[PDB]
Design a protein around this ligand. Structure first.
Ligand code: BOG
Ligand code: BOG
Ligand code: BOG
Ligand code: BOG
Ligand code: BOG
Ligand code: BOG
Ligand code: BOG
Ligand code: BOG
Ligand code: BOG
Ligand code: BOG
Ligand code: BOG
Ligand code: BOG
Lengths: 307, 307, 307
């Protein structure tokens, strides 16, 4: 099937950057235009990708079956509901009713998804030590942070805090065994682009947190940013090793983290906290996601995108 | 010996539900009656069980010796001081002086217990990977949350926060390796009823927290509830697997978690936060502990309770 | 080479105790004298030790090379920048300009150090399960807490909170796998003195936190203290096992934790919170670091300090 599930990272990353620029509108009006263009690109890619995936469910169902049951690959499916909610969040600026349908479909879906599949891992005997990949953050952690921000947007803040709490504690509970496994075993080259997901948790956390708490940059938020930057420096240093066997579309896995860096940076800028670190983060993230776009345009014009 | 240490889960669960109903008195006066009846049942079962256990110490001491030294079974002993404190908490409504004796005996006991036994595990060579069971939450985590709430009740809030902090950080520090071990190895049928303890931490946490912080439902509390509900959904889905080889009195291990669900729910209802989720949680927990009571009455009348 | 890297624990511990006494000046003026004497001793030992280590870099460079690459021994190098910052903090009372040079050198150094070396562990294949030692807290956790407090002192509170957050979350993320490894494997006698580092995190955490947050003893701070005392009781009980094969200069590894116990205790005393527990902690820590000094004076006069 020509569409790898992982490619939902593309509208994921583009949609989150849209939302990041959106929060700048009231400081710099031209940011709205930029926010709108990214949101439209992201929504169109999401529509294309949802229709391709429906095509897969219908005619390549065994391949979805097998990725669903894999203790490793099941995770990427969580990107479907996540981008669904993020597109819904973009659309809210134009049609709050369609946005809310999309947000609930995505929230119910991810919750149902993790309850069915993540819990089942606890029966033992299928997940193995080498199953301890960064992609596990998706169903467990990123899905919940996205429901939390998206439900806040619709005015459900208390409900938002529940899903936030689920994401935050799930993250702290998984990372310990992940980092220990990387230390000991690490990852073979073909999985290494997924190290980009390791960037995500702190930054997606604080961005979701600031969405629910009215943009108030407090101690918790500063604390998350600190640890976010620590992981960024580590990943920067690791980058040559990560792309040891070459650059590839898998690198879109950094995009959710990078985009949350941009988003959180806008909140910090608004609240007048580390404004310089903010400008740096926002510009850095944008340039990098920009490089991902240029490399994806390159591959599209060398017939090397789809399978 | 006819009394398994695990059976202290019974007055544990009944006592915590008593305390849960107690907090409803000022919204609905008939809740006091219900709180009192459960507290009396719980206290009577606790007296019976304490006298049976003293009997074991005296005439079956090798069996206590061996459970004490087991890296797995030592944990259930922590239920003795825990229920001791909870009974003390019930009794406070009638006799604050006896309640405080019981609360200090239970606090000193659990602290002394964990300091002697839990620390010793760090000498290595006795605890094994397959020793990573949910029952380890008892000495480490539940004991401390119970001291914290119980010491708050007597007016020692700052002292309460120390034990709370010990419980909360101990929990976050153990769960990561527990969940990883369940993923990989899981648990054989005879230990599976102890999955019910996994429900407990978030809910016992927030309940203890609300006891110390004057019932103020804040961000931390909402965060804990979110993760509590995530684990509930997982455990619900896992339930058929949990009771694969049949229903049994071991299922009383859910009761501390269920009861803390009820207790925290009353605090949330009072503070006007997610009142509907609150009614659901309170009713759910009560029905389930109610089912545990009916199944225990059933077994008592088939001579299948004691050994 | 006559100086083991670990011996930087000596000025580390002495410098942190200096800072602890410093905070008592405004309650009890004679504490300044005591603070100054310790700070001078600590600074002189630090100068001696820095010059010995420069000597090692220059003429014994292969030995630094090999300790740098060890997945276990690399950690102790982090003590160089840590004590550098702490000496800088002492000196601030006399010369704020030299203090700030030292603080930035130490912050840039530790950050650069961890980014180069700690991240590299994630390439796998060098760090092993038996590499899971308490010394790993140094580069990861203690280095960051020291930058955070030291940058607060110079007036950079928001920057302080970033490094604090990095330390705090790094700690919670490592301890889980550490404690599990001690439970299963523990440590051979020659590494056991490093159990003293396990005392450090909660107490260094809360001390750094109180430095940044203006000494305000809040819920988070009480929570950290609770868990700090839990680990203290465990370590007390473990002590005979720790010194099974004899007392040795390695025991200076407790000194950062003990000194942070003293420091945090002063903040708690000021804010009128658990003042009695505070007096106990302050006196306890001082007596113990005092015993370490007497045993070090003893060994110095038996020619059994340097190699
Ligand atoms: C979007 C992701 C879709 C998930 C596809 C799920 C595969 C379901 O799993 C299957 O379903 C059958 C019953 O329905 C089972 O009995 C099969 O044994 C099992 O393979
Ligand atoms: C894309 C997000 C929505 C979730 C869709 C997945 C539906 C799961 O499918 C389920 O797979 C199970 C195994 O866990 C089967 O046993 C069940 O019959 C089936 O309901
Ligand atoms: C695991 C990481 C969790 C870090 C805990 C967050 C610290 C909470 O910070 C708190 O909230 C307010 C925010 O300005 C402060 O006023 C409070 O005094 C402080 O306790
Ligand atoms: C998330 C960070 C993005 C916000 C970027 C805006 C940077 C604008 O730059 C700032 O403009 C100010 C006035 O508007 C000037 O006075 C500042 O000195 C200048 O740095
Ligand atoms: C309520 C739980 C009671 C715990 C029973 C503890 C068993 C103690 O342990 C024992 O104690 C002896 C000394 O007292 C030791 O020397 C024995 O070796 C050891 O087995
Ligand atoms: C029920 C809660 C109270 C705690 C009672 C347990 C007392 C522990 O018993 C102890 O066992 C040790 C091993 O750890 C022995 O070495 C000690 O001699 C003994 O004091
Ligand atoms: C590991 C899980 C810890 C979650 C951290 C709790 C977040 C603390 O929440 C804090 O406390 C107050 C409560 O309303 C808020 O005002 C503060 O602004 C916020 O920082
Ligand atoms: C922990 C939750 C338990 C509290 C349960 C009480 C539910 C009562 O029900 C509520 O009564 C209100 C008035 O008292 C009505 O006005 C509400 O609409 C009704 O929902
Ligand atoms: C204060 C601690 C100093 C760290 C000493 C670092 C050892 C560096 O590591 C080395 O550096 C060379 C290049 O510079 C490498 O190519 C060598 O392979 C590698 O051994
Ligand atoms: C004492 C704190 C300051 C940090 C000094 C250490 C400098 C690291 O040295 C580095 O070692 C690398 C391997 O990780 C080599 O590959 C690099 O060439 C070298 O830059
Ligand atoms: C992992 C351990 C983290 C513990 C979380 C800290 C709890 C934060 O405590 C918070 O900050 C203020 C401090 O007085 C309170 O007012 C807030 O109401 C409370 O949420
Ligand atoms: C970190 C704790 C160190 C502070 C130690 C000072 C202890 C002094 O002691 C206190 O002095 C008070 C007046 O100053 C008396 O009134 C108190 O009762 C007495 O306990």
């Amino acid at each position: 099937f020509p569409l790898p599930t992982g490619y939902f990272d593309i509208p994921l990353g583009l949609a989150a950057l849209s939302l990041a620029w959106f929060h700048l509108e009231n400081l710099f009006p031209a940011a709205r235009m930029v926010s709108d263009v990214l949101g439209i690109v992201a929504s169109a890619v999401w529509i294309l990708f949802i229709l391709m995936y429906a095509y897969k469910l219908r005619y390549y169902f065994e391949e979805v079956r097998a990725e669903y049951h894999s203790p490793v690959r099941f995770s990427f499916i969580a990107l479907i509901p996540i981008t669904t909610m993020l597109v819904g969040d973009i659309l809210y600026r134009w049609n709050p009713l369609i946005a809310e349908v999309l947000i609930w479909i995505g929230t119910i879906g991810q919750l149902l998804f993790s309850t069915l599949r993540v819990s089942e891992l606890w029966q033992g005997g299928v997940f193995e030590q080498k199953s301890t990949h960064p992609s596990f953050y998706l169903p467990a952690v990123a899905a919940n942070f996205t429901s939390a921000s998206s439900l806040a947007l619709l005015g459900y803040h208390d409900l938002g805090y529940l899903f936030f709490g689920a994401g935050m504690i799930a993250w702290i509970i998984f990372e310990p065994v992940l980092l220990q496994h990387l230390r000991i075993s690490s990852l073979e080259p073909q999985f290494r682009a997924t190290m980009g997901i390791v960037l995500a948790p702190a930054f997606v956390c604080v961005s979701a947190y600031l969405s629910i708490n009215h943009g108030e940059v407090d101690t918790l938020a500063k604390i998350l940013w600190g640890y976010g930057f620590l992981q960024l420096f580590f990943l920067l240093r690791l980058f040559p090793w990560i792309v040891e066997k070459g650059l590839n579309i898998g690198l879109w896995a950094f995009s959710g983290g990078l985009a949350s860096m941009a988003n959180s940076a806008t909140a910090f800028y608004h609240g007048n906290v580390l404004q310089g670190v903010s400008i740096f983060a926002f510009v850095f993230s944008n340039v990098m996601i920009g490089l991902l776009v240029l490399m994806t345009i390159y591959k599209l014009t060398k017939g090397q995108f789809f399978l």
